Amino acid sequence: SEEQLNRYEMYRRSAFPKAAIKRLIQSITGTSVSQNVVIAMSGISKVFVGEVVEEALDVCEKWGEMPPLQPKHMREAVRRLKSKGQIPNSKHKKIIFF
Amino acid sequence: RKRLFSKELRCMMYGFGDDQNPYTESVDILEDLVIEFITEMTHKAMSIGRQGRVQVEDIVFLIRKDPRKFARVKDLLTMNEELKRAR
């Protein structure tokens, strides 16, 4: 239609800027990264945003609300993703044997 | 901290079906997920392989967790060479 073609345009053309993530990663490493790191790390974070919004619209469709996304559907989105191990936290030393 | 992903993330939520005008407190949440996702995939990437940040260990975490992040990183590494072959 005429909205699906505009939505497909924003699904492809949108990206995080490489001039800021290279500034963001290098504040964590200390020295330097490469261009093929920033190209991949800018691409995984678009999949991760698409992992949340496609699942936060499943929370909103499950409850009785409309397309505008309140934060109620966004804290619930991170809760359901973390219970399936999708959201990694490297500060919780987990233990499976008890 | 200011918001470094305020205008970029509004295009992306529209790209996955949200609205043309998302709420400010919803982009407040998604901007903090991405900064933690890049932090909790760099803090764990500087212990694997070596104490640097080569991209041969960024591709390790994407398998056995979610195959969409792996099938969309093999496309960005293949298309880097088909966009330098055209020049």
Partner: peptide, 26 residues
């Protein structure tokens, strides 16, 4: 020179269509 000016035109239309009014929520 063609790659330098056309890169910012994919993002310039990404500030005219999406996000016209800024909302909030209780």
């Amino acid at each position: 020179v063609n790659l330098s000016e056309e890169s910012a035109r994919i993002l310039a239309t990404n500030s005219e269509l999406v996000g016209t009014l800024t909302r909030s929520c209780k």
